[PDB]
Design a protein around this motif. Structure first.
Motif, PDB file in Angstrom:
ATOM      1  N   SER A   1      13.957  60.690   3.425  1.00  0.00           N
ATOM      2  CA  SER A   1      13.878  61.156   4.804  1.00  0.00           C
ATOM      3  C   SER A   1      14.620  62.464   5.090  1.00  0.00           C
ATOM      4  N   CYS A   2      13.982  63.318   5.882  1.00  0.00           N
ATOM      5  CA  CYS A   2      14.588  64.532   6.461  1.00  0.00           C
ATOM      6  C   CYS A   2      15.518  64.154   7.611  1.00  0.00           C
ATOM      7  N   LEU A   3      15.178  63.037   8.250  1.00  0.00           N
ATOM      8  CA  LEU A   3      15.875  62.550   9.439  1.00  0.00           C
ATOM      9  C   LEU A   3      16.839  61.399   9.146  1.00  0.00           C
ATOM     10  N   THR A   4      18.086  61.545   9.600  1.00  0.00           N
ATOM     11  CA  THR A   4      19.024  60.436   9.692  1.00  0.00           C
ATOM     12  C   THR A   4      18.491  59.298  10.579  1.00  0.00           C
ATOM     13  N   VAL A   5      19.149  58.144  10.542  1.00  0.00           N
ATOM     14  CA  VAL A   5      18.816  56.992  11.383  1.00  0.00           C
ATOM     15  C   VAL A   5      18.848  57.423  12.866  1.00  0.00           C
TER      16      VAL A   5
ATOM     17  N   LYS B   1      11.473  49.991   8.701  1.00  0.00           N
ATOM     18  CA  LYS B   1      12.385  49.556   7.672  1.00  0.00           C
ATOM     19  C   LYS B   1      13.004  50.763   6.990  1.00  0.00           C
ATOM     20  N   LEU B   2      14.326  50.807   7.055  1.00  0.00           N
ATOM     21  CA  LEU B   2      15.122  51.809   6.384  1.00  0.00           C
ATOM     22  C   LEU B   2      15.244  51.473   4.891  1.00  0.00           C
ATOM     23  N   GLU B   3      15.085  52.480   4.046  1.00  0.00           N
ATOM     24  CA  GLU B   3      15.346  52.333   2.620  1.00  0.00           C
ATOM     25  C   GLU B   3      16.832  52.452   2.352  1.00  0.00           C
ATOM     26  N   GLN B   4      17.297  51.955   1.206  1.00  0.00           N
ATOM     27  CA  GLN B   4      18.639  52.326   0.738  1.00  0.00           C
ATOM     28  C   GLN B   4      18.791  53.841   0.829  1.00  0.00           C
ATOM     29  N   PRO B   5      19.871  54.298   1.459  1.00  0.00           N
ATOM     30  CA  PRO B   5      20.007  55.740   1.719  1.00  0.00           C
ATOM     31  C   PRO B   5      19.923  56.607   0.453  1.00  0.00           C
TER      32      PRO B   5
ATOM     33  N   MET C   1       6.513  53.194  12.205  1.00  0.00           N
ATOM     34  CA  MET C   1       7.024  54.523  11.887  1.00  0.00           C
ATOM     35  C   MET C   1       7.151  54.583  10.386  1.00  0.00           C
ATOM     36  N   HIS C   2       6.773  55.706   9.808  1.00  0.00           N
ATOM     37  CA  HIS C   2       6.732  55.804   8.355  1.00  0.00           C
ATOM     38  C   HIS C   2       8.179  55.793   7.841  1.00  0.00           C
ATOM     39  N   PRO C   3       8.438  55.159   6.674  1.00  0.00           N
ATOM     40  CA  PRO C   3       9.838  55.198   6.240  1.00  0.00           C
ATOM     41  C   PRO C   3      10.357  56.636   6.072  1.00  0.00           C
ATOM     42  N   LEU C   4       9.519  57.557   5.592  1.00  0.00           N
ATOM     43  CA  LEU C   4       9.812  59.002   5.672  1.00  0.00           C
ATOM     44  C   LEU C   4       8.688  59.714   6.458  1.00  0.00           C
ATOM     45  N   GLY C   5       9.038  60.480   7.488  1.00  0.00           N
ATOM     46  CA  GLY C   5       8.041  61.159   8.333  1.00  0.00           C
ATOM     47  C   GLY C   5       8.295  62.656   8.390  1.00  0.00           C
ATOM     48  N   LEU C   6       7.225  63.455   8.375  1.00  0.00           N
ATOM     49  CA  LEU C   6       7.336  64.914   8.207  1.00  0.00           C
ATOM     50  C   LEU C   6       7.939  65.224   6.827  1.00  0.00           C
ATOM     51  N   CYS C   7       9.070  65.936   6.777  1.00  0.00           N
ATOM     52  CA  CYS C   7       9.676  66.277   5.497  1.00  0.00           C
ATOM     53  C   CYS C   7       8.653  66.968   4.595  1.00  0.00           C
TER      54      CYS C   7
END
Lengths: 143, 138
Positions: B65-69, B56-60, B38-44
């Protein structure tokens, strides 16, 4: 010992969202394979003798042995399916209830994947879904 | 609560394990499927039903990301995931968010990994596909 079998039907919107529908079913884990969870696309197997991507669940309806012309025993069928990429195999044993003893016998080398049997109500249920159409997914759970 | 993740790799078949945890964002149950990055940021991208997502989640404060965890977990399940696995190494707070006392837990497992367990997972995902995950609750 007891294996909870969850059969999943699913449909997608052309925008990629899925809606899933689930129906429950019980069988048993056998000594012929491990007592663990498994999940994969259901494939109805056919007796005579890779046809599918690794990770399938094989569903086999066994026939009464006195009338059975097949080459492979129930244990032979379990083994082949796994060799050919199955992540589990579910046998319907209503016609051949000696098959349970065979699957539960002392095992010279038990398979790493689940080998499950169903009968009765739960088998008619399974085979109604296996027949009705393909594109069903089986979740085999160990609680 | 511990989640046993076995990954099957191909070339014919071999296996290799690692550990993480079941969050309350989802159920405590087993699941198995082909891994999907899954892309670290998807859509947006459309996949087959029954995949296991892995991100892998980036430092917030660096995350676009448009989407929360949670949002990524729900969206992954909507789009046919059987389970979701987060590498949370770089976002400890993702843990507290997935563990919120939730009225709304998903029926699928939402697992997270970190430390060397996660380094091992992400290395398999970055390299190339044809990997399948089995998530077990022992």
């Amino acid at each position: 010992d007891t294996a909870f079998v969850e059969v999943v039907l699913f449909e997608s919107s052309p925008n990629g969202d899925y809606t899933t529908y689930t129906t429950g079913l019980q069988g048993r884990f056998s000594r012929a394979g491990a007592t663990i969870s498994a999940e994969g696309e259901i494939v109805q197997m056919h007796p005579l003798g890779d046809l599918y991507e690794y990770g399938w669940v094989g569903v086999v309806k066994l026939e009464q042995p006195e009338l059975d012309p097949s080459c492979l025993t129930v244990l032979g069928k379990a083994k082949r399916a796994v060799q050919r990429g199955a992540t589990a195999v579910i046998f319907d044993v209503s016609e051949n209830p000696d098959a349970i003893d065979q699957l539960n016998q002392v095992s010279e080398d038990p398979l790493k994947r689940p080998v499950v049997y169903v009968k009765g109500a739960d088998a008619v249920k399974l085979m109604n879904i296996v027949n009705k159409q393909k594109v069903a997914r089986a979740r085999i759970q160990h609680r």
